[PDB]
Write a protein that binds this DNA or RNA. Structure first.
Length: 88
DNA sequence: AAAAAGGGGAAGTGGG
DNA sequence: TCCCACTTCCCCTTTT
């Protein structure tokens, strides 16, 4: 099944959900979530995953924080902004 | 102050 | 069975 980081990257590079997420610094791989619209993106993640419960941004960031352990995505010190590793 | 964002141990779930 | 990649819970610390 698809990985969360790909889900997010595929969205950035396609362009749907520009109300929910966008590139802060594309070349560098920095992307940011919208405060008011992040939930709609998080819910789509769950619908797609086929989770039995409803996906929230809180639970999605919980998973996101795990990539900081393996390096795929890291949190940047700006509100709702993360950064993909040399893979973006 | 108050609310949003950030955090993380640990048990639980689904697919392979 | 076990492993992985989250997912759910629940509650606490920091930034805005």
């Amino acid at each position: 099944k698809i990985r969360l980081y790909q889900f997010l990257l595929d969205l950035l590079r396609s362009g749907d959900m520009k109300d929910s997420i966008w590139w802060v610094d594309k070349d560098k791989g920095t992307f940011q979530f919208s405060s008011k619209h992040k939930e709609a993106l998080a819910h789509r993640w769950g619908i797609q995953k086929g989770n039995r419960k409803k996906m929230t941004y809180e639970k999605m960031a919980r998973a996101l924080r795990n990539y900081g352990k393996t390096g795929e995505v890291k949190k940047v010190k700006k509100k709702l902004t993360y950064q993909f590793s040399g893979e973006v």
